[PDB]
Design a protein around this motif. Structure first.
Motif: not given
Lengths: 233, 233
Positions: A75-83
């Motif tokens: 499993i590869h992290p690509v992007f992130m975002r805020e709640a």
């Protein structure tokens, strides 16, 4: 389709636009199936090339249901975002952050899979509120939770249909994709929670699947599409 | 016993001492059953008075398995504590926080219920690391995870038996109760995650259950016992 992706509802909005951009430039076709796991799990068993996820824990739980083809180690992290806090249009109660959700009269919807649905928002609210380091604050917030929703559709429905619901703790990308449903209020820096968009490529992948995986995970074109919805690297 | 509590392993250490303190002062007997849910779930169906939890999401998933007697709306936060990094005795790699876990050669155990076990640590690591607001950091940390353990015993075993395991992301209360197994390193302020100890009292509770619930949730005596293990209000 030459490449089939499966994952939760939400990130499908930018993911489909990435698929469309990819299809404009070359000849292979890319299909994005999305929604609660139970709606597509058996189809993914037959032809999934890539599983996409909307958090780390939910992606792991989903991938474990397909271990013969997908490894949890890949499993590869690509992007992130805020709640964020989704509030009713016009913000009638003048909510300015998580601290305001501790007030009397505030009704809150949170997401929690409750051990029966693999949903991205489980444990977001407790982790944000816990950074206030005050158990009376955790009690106040929890006492204002009207609905612990197992998935996105049930949370959206509770928010839209409930006149006493003032807030839904959800993702910035959902709010940006659905601006007519509510307005967004950011969490305070100190209490903000960020989770990722990830993908896992099947073992023995096709050349087409590899190509799309590379485009999605590394392209500036894909990054720009996801950035429109609040995602970042 | 007059009062029966059920919940995960870990908080049973101070909880038993609270039970013992209560039993010294009055005549009723209090039994604490602890460990993974599957080891006691059927017994809790027969005589549980109170379910205790080691996080909000895990408590909700467990209580949902007993909805006829316990309401998810009645889960009550009592104390909270910080997640920590358990390192091998003497801290041979000189780990000073979560940033050090991004280095090459670091092996990490995290807890993740993976949709099959209701365990308190699910999503702690992603929420801590996500506050670094950097997807390359999330990739680096994740690539150092050797074990995604579904419960406390499996994580402890992986840590103790694995010469390549340098860190277990767990709770400060576990470290304090088990000081011969490893040393503790705090997470940086900016990335620290705090979760609660909670309880839910059965519907139509006995007077004995009410009395113990009050003592546990409100007494300064109970607070002092839990504080020894890093818990706070």
């Amino acid at each position: 389709a030459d490449v089939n992706l499966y994952g939760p509802g939400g990130p499908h909005v930018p993911l489909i636009k990435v698929a469309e951009s990819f299809e404009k430039s070359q000849s292979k076709r890319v299909n994005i199936t999305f929604g609660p796991q139970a709606t597509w799990n058996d189809k993914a068993k037959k032809n999934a090339d890539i599983l996409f996820g909307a958090s780390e824990h939910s992606a792991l739980a989903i991938a474990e249901g397909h271990s013969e083809r997908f490894s949890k180690f890949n499993i590869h992290p690509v992007f992130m975002r805020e709640a964020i806090i989704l509030v009713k249009k016009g913000n009638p109660k003048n909510i300015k952050g998580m601290a305001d959700l501790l007030k009397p009269g505030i009704g809150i919807v949170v997401n929690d899979g409750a051990g029966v649905s693999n949903t991205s928002g489980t444990a977001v609210w407790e982790d944000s509120v816990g950074r206030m380091k005050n158990v009376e604050k955790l009690q106040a917030f929890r006492s204002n939770i009207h609905v612990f929703a197992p998935n996105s559709g049930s949370a959206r429905k509770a928010f839209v249909d409930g006149e006493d619901i003032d807030a839904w703790i959800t993702w910035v990308d959902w709010a940006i994709a659905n601006p007519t449903i509510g307005d967004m209020v950011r969490m305070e820096d100190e209490y903000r929670i960020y989770r990722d968009f990830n993908v896992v490529l099947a073992k023995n992948p096709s050349s087409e699947a590899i190509d799309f995986f590379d485009y999605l995970t590394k392209s500036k074109d894909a990054e720009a599409i996801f950035q429109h919805y609040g995602w970042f690297k």
